[PDB]
Amino acid sequence: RTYLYRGRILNLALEGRYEIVEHKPAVAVIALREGRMLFVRQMRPAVGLAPLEIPAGLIEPGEDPLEAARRQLAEETGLSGDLTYLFSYFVSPGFTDEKTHVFLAENLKEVEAEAIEVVWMRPEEALERHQRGEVEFSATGLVGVLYYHAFLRG
Amino acid sequence: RTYLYRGRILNLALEGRYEIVEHKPAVAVIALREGRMLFVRQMRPAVGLAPLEIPAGLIEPGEDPLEAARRQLAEETGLSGDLTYLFSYFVSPGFTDEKTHVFLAENLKEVEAEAIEVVWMRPEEALERHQRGEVEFSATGLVGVLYYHAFLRG
Ligand SMILES: [Mg+2]
Ligand SMILES: [Mg+2]
Numbered sequence: 001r002t003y004l005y006r007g008r009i010l011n012l013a014l015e016g017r018y019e020i021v022e023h024k025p026a027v028a029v030i031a032l033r034e035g036r037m038l039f040v041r042q043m044r045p046a047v048g049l050a051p052l053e054i055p056a057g058l059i060e061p062g063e064d065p066l067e068a069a070r071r072q073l074a075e076e077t078g079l080s081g082d083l084t085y086l087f088s089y090f091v092s093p094g095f096t097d098e099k100t101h102v103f104l105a106e107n108l109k110e111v112e113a114e115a116i117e118v119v120w121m122r123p124e125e126a127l128e129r130h131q132r133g134e135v136e137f138s139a140t141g142l143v144g145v146l147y148y149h150a151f152l153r154g
Numbered sequence: 155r156t157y158l159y160r161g162r163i164l165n166l167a168l169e170g171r172y173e174i175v176e177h178k179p180a181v182a183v184i185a186l187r188e189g190r191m192l193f194v195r196q197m198r199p200a201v202g203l204a205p206l207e208i209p210a211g212l213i214e215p216g217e218d219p220l221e222a223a224r225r226q227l228a229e230e231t232g233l234s235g236d237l238t239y240l241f242s243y244f245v246s247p248g249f250t251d252e253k254t255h256v257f258l259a260e261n262l263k264e265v266e267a268e269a270i271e272v273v274w275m276r277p278e279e280a281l282e283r284h285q286r287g288e289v290e291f292s293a294t295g296l297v298g299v300l301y302y303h304a305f306l307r308g
Contacts (some may be wrong), residue, residue, distance in 0.1 A: 097298070138247045
């Protein structure tokens with residue numbers, strides 16, 4: 001593997017003819033309260049709009065997935081809860097190695113009081129708005145919505 | 155936006171301090187038959203392993219999402235079916251603009267008879283194997299699994 005670029009959040013390398021973007025692993029947190037899911041929105045220059053996502057971020061040096069999940073939840077929403085590991089996925093294995101570890105958060109407590117907008121919304125409504133073309137989803141946002149519809153309903 | 159690299163499936167640009175990877179949009183197809191979901195696996199140099207995915211691929215010039223979905227299903231699995239658009243998502247809006255359009259395929263018919271391995275598997279079993287750390291998921295594979303558990307069960 002030969003490198004063409006070493007950046008802040010990514011490296012661009014060539015492995016033969018394959019173009020590979022190395023990227024730090026990430027975490028995402030699914031949280032439900034009173035039937036609303038905890039979504040967040042922020043300007044995303046890469047896409048030119050603010051898609052509906054769930055608390056997420058990169059895992060930093062020294063941190064493991066669970067710890068990063070805690071930090072991202074607190075830094076983006078000011079909350080903490082009991083986290084449980086759910087599953088993981090590669091965002092787009094065809095060109096990048098970014099892997100995302102998803103956690104479920106329960107018994108949320110506000111521990112703190114912005115570039116990131118906190119958007120509490122019933123998953124049913126998020127799905128409907130998307131179907132109506134009013135909002136876009138990030139992989140984490142869609143995963144949160146589908147996960148809810150599959151195992152957390154009522 | 156200034157470009158540092160123009161490749162085959164991606165461009166690397168800088169928008170101020172933001173590192174942005176331009177990528178063609180993609181499609182993914184969820185298909186269930188006799189309780190098994192249509193997964194596919196292939197060597198993915200970017201991740202160094204073969205994660206569990208569902209039929210997917212890039213949308214080529216002149217093609218719209220629905221047409222690309224048809225092609226990817228036929229080229230990777232040799233099947234065709236009645237496709238319905240479900241939803242879309244940005245794989246990782248923090249650095250790339252790759253957007254994936256997901257479709258549901260029903261009434262599958264084999265129209266044709268490999269780098270891509272066809273893996274029919276009950277979603278329940280795919281989820282269990284993943285939980286056991288025996289298989290990894292791509293975003294498309296996980297989305298397929300969660301979608302099934304949420305709206306196609308029985
Ligand atoms: Mg961070
Ligand atoms: Mg193709």
